[PDB]
Design a protein around this ligand. Sequence first.
Ligand SMILES: *[C@@H]1O[C@H](CO)[C@@H](O[C@@H]2O[C@H](CO)[C@@H](O)[C@H](O)[C@H]2NC(C)=O)[C@H](O)[C@H]1NC(C)=O
Ligand SMILES: *[C@@H]1O[C@H](CO)[C@@H](O[C@@H]2O[C@H](CO)[C@@H](O)[C@H](O)[C@H]2NC(C)=O)[C@H](O)[C@H]1NC(C)=O
Ligand SMILES: *[C@@H]1O[C@H](CO)[C@@H](O[C@@H]2O[C@H](CO)[C@@H](O)[C@H](O)[C@H]2NC(C)=O)[C@H](O)[C@H]1NC(C)=O
Ligand SMILES: N[C@@H](Cc1c[nH]c2ccccc12)C(=O)O
Ligand SMILES: N[C@@H](Cc1c[nH]c2ccccc12)C(=O)O
Ligand SMILES: *[C@@H]1O[C@H](CO)[C@@H](O)[C@H](O)[C@H]1NC(C)=O
Ligand SMILES: *[C@@H]1O[C@H](CO)[C@@H](O)[C@H](O)[C@H]1NC(C)=O
Ligand SMILES: *[C@@H]1O[C@H](CO)[C@@H](O)[C@H](O)[C@H]1NC(C)=O
Ligand SMILES: [Ca+2]
Ligand SMILES: [Ca+2]
Lengths: 480, 484
Amino acid sequence: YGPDQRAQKKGDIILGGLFPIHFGVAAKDQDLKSRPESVECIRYNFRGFRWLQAMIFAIEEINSSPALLPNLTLGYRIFDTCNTVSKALEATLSFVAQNKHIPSTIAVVGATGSGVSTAVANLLGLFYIPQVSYASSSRLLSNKNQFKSFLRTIPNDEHQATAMADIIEYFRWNWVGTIAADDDYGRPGIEKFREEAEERDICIDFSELISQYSDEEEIQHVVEVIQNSTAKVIVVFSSGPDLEPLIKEIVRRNITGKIWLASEAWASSSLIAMPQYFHVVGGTIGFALKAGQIPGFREFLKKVHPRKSVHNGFAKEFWEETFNCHLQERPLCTGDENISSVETPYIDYTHLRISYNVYLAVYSIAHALQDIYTCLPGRGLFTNGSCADIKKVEAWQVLKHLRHLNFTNNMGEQVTFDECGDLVGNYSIINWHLSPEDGSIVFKEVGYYNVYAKKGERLFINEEKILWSGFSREVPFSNC
Amino acid sequence: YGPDQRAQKKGDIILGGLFPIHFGVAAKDQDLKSRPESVECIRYNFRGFRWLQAMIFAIEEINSSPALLPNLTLGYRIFDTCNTVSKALEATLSFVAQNKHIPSTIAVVGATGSGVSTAVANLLGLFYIPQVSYASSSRLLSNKNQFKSFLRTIPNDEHQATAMADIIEYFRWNWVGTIAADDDYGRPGIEKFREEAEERDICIDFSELISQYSDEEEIQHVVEVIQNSTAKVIVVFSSGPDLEPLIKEIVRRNITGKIWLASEAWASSSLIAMPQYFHVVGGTIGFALKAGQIPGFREFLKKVHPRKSVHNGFAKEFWEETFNCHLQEFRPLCTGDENISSVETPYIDYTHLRISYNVYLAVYSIAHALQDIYTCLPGRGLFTNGSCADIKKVEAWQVLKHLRHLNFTNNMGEQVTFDECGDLVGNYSIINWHLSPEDGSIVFKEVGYYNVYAKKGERLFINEEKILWSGFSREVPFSNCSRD
Ligand SMILES: *[C@@H]1O[C@H](CO)[C@@H](O[C@@H]2O[C@H](CO)[C@@H](O)[C@H](O)[C@H]2NC(C)=O)[C@H](O)[C@H]1NC(C)=O
Ligand SMILES: *[C@@H]1O[C@H](CO)[C@@H](O[C@@H]2O[C@H](CO)[C@@H](O)[C@H](O)[C@H]2NC(C)=O)[C@H](O)[C@H]1NC(C)=O
Ligand SMILES: *[C@@H]1O[C@H](CO)[C@@H](O[C@@H]2O[C@H](CO)[C@@H](O)[C@H](O)[C@H]2NC(C)=O)[C@H](O)[C@H]1NC(C)=O
Ligand SMILES: N[C@@H](Cc1c[nH]c2ccccc12)C(=O)O
Ligand SMILES: N[C@@H](Cc1c[nH]c2ccccc12)C(=O)O
Ligand SMILES: *[C@@H]1O[C@H](CO)[C@@H](O)[C@H](O)[C@H]1NC(C)=O
Ligand SMILES: *[C@@H]1O[C@H](CO)[C@@H](O)[C@H](O)[C@H]1NC(C)=O
Ligand SMILES: *[C@@H]1O[C@H](CO)[C@@H](O)[C@H](O)[C@H]1NC(C)=O
Ligand SMILES: [Ca+2]
Ligand SMILES: [Ca+2]
């Protein structure tokens, strides 16, 4: 066994999952005067519970389609990582139990953070179990001499760093500053951006590192390095949880007049995009991925219930955190409430971008299994052209099949992995505005970034649709 | 349970160990046409076997000392990592199996590389098992949020970057290039060196990354970048295995006239300090640690035997590699009475003990924490109500708690305490690569030191009269972009 709070189903082939239902763990000092106890998690993530339902919906769709895997069923075992390495390792130790009563896991759909993904892959690669991530994008995971069984449905960050350099060069600036998160996602990206910007003759004034668990003194020190600079453009490679304290402190001091360039990790985060921070973070220009279509998904999301869903263990806490009640086994829950009456990121969305990667990964695994199913003798990828046995399939055979995958998605495009298990994708450039009728922060698309074009003709920006600092139509000046 | 070859002993308390007996694993691409099998390690490491013997010597010395933990016995289980993450992870999975019929491990002497140490600590901190490292010096391991039970007996790498910047400023240079290894040891150190340099008005021309498994194209690109530059001083944060291919490629192209600044990982490596490379890597200036004295270490080293060291399983391959003979269960059969003094190998070819002393101190730290556990009185304990831990039923977190509060004197009269981050502070020694007039090998000569207990600006001391700038020159080179 492992963590108690989980969602699982019984089937012929079992799949794993790792989602961040909580934002982090609680800060409790340990003087180790008595026996240590397991740490708890603090903040609920309504957007992270929408990604799990995508995998569940995809599996349930596969089980009902006779063309994909007839006479077979799929199960799952999905755990919560709370965006922490230790909890992810504790969950993973149960995935590889029998390989060293416990069903064997064929594949695991990866985690979000790059630091968590490296730790999980270091353990999964021992037994050659494939792992498909949907959000990890650090160039360090492309090394096949260390990460043997890692795959992606999301591109890495070198293109995005080059795009930031191109954007800066397009608007004729040469005096900028940089801020990055102290993890495996922030440092490589900001290093690549620095390498790109030095070639184009752009001067960088300062460079600082931030973290979610930073104390008061270093946050104060970082704040009064921005205040002592004539640079208006600041480039940030971080996530919302790692950036929240700095934004709070800057708002507390009422620092205005800067231009923020946001990476896709926090270019759409609900933690930073809040109406009371708009006079500091308004006018941000950021990146977003390309959205896809999953018909029938919203109907599947809208039917969740703490009592009807017996296979999902996270439904009770979802209900409690939604309606602010307590389930009888703070008011009591009648169980007859309506989800639509509460505005939360669960069904308050405009596009499916990360949640379209989970669906795509699940179909990747399904199509690899289908190819295993229909191997005619003498046409296999194994020794002497022999084929695998679908009744006794193994994880390494699934890995060979995913290494050689080439299938079509529901939108008519082709999906296939390159030599490093990576992909290629278009980028979308958005701008932060203010809703006149409601006051919420609205993302407006103002261009894109082609990746299949020649090196120099990749960026398109329509400046006529950009508001600078949220109110002005004039391009600012940053030159020293 | 675990790997096959190991060194093992029985006792009341079990310790763990991880040493790189091999330099690396074999580079065979794996096709999935058949079931994957275990990979094999290729190159033997005679220096890593000397570190393994220090732990055994310390344990045996403790077991015979009535003044330290009497009426108790210590055991061990030592594995080989081949400086690869997967092997160390298998060993660690062996270590924690019943900590969740197997004796429990209460402490582990950590790994050598920073990536391996990080991967081991990620899993060891789950069960609150203390881990004392002797060679990992990355600054990313000082984060107590992620690494909860990590200790080390070697200082981190901040002062080395500061000292390199100080040296460059002292010799009046403003045009350098940087090369680093693509791991957790090279990147943070080289980043720290860049910041200190810019604050000191030093311009950097190029920056490159290298690895042990780089292909021809990357090495050729790095070589092309180096020789299309007018910078003479090159700063390298790497180790010998990660630097060897680039050095070989540079040597075969006959590239001379460069000044190398070496970190402690490769400033004394036998893979780089070869007489055949002297016309390229001669005159290097590097850093070394302070040395200690172990009164009877060499006598213990000299008595190894493949038929008498029952508890040691690496002695057989050590003998076969040393004497180039094949032991009967075409290489000649080993006679069994062959002296180890005839063969010149780094096993007993040393001048100072620096990392072996670190292993020694790592073992005595745990011994003294256990002695503190044993010799306490009620009402004065470190626990909730002053209660003392039971020595018979001791647990790992109690040992970690006493390690966090350790304070004891070593055999050299100094004090050993761990700070809030589990770190030590130490001096540095600055050395220079010469050519031996008699033997013809490379001789490391001390020409200065770095003091960490002084104030900023008065930490570096250099004696310029003892420096040979390329093994033969006596004048400081010129490394400015443009003339004054
Ligand atoms: C700020 O610096 C940029 C970059 O040097 C300037 O952009 C240049 O503008 C001139 C026309 O005024 C062009 O001929 C150059 O080709 C531009 N540079 C580039 C991108 O190559 C910008 O004008 C400067 N602004 C001020 C007024 O200081
Ligand atoms: C190489 O450049 C350095 C840096 O500009 C020069 O060092 C400076 O020399 C002047 C002249 O004596 C001093 O006033 C400065 O204090 C020096 N700076 C530092 C940081 O030491 C150096 O002289 C140049 N070397 C040559 C041969 O031209
Ligand atoms: C680090 O090195 C410095 C300098 O070599 C040591 O300081 C010296 O200590 C001796 C012994 O007391 C004194 O006689 C010298 O006068 C000191 N030198 C200076 C410049 O003050 C220091 O003790 C060393 N640190 C350790 C921990 O050994
Ligand atoms: N790729 C990011 C994770 C991420 C991508 N998009 C996100 C959106 C929300 C939260 C996290 C993410 C990382 O490496 O850490
Ligand atoms: N300090 C190095 C390890 C190391 C020190 N001395 C060495 C000698 C040989 C090999 C490795 C080392 C690291 O952080 O990784
Ligand atoms: C994938 O399949 C398509 C359609 O059969 C084919 O044109 C293409 O060459 C295949 N391979 C790749 C790498 O796209
Ligand atoms: C990316 O955008 C360009 C814009 O012209 C388009 O031509 C191309 O088809 C897009 N590619 C994908 C994969 O969406
Ligand atoms: C350790 O003990 C010595 C005396 O035995 C004392 O001088 C020293 O200050 C102690 N260490 C610390 C960190 O207080
Ligand atoms: Ca089916
Ligand atoms: Ca004793």
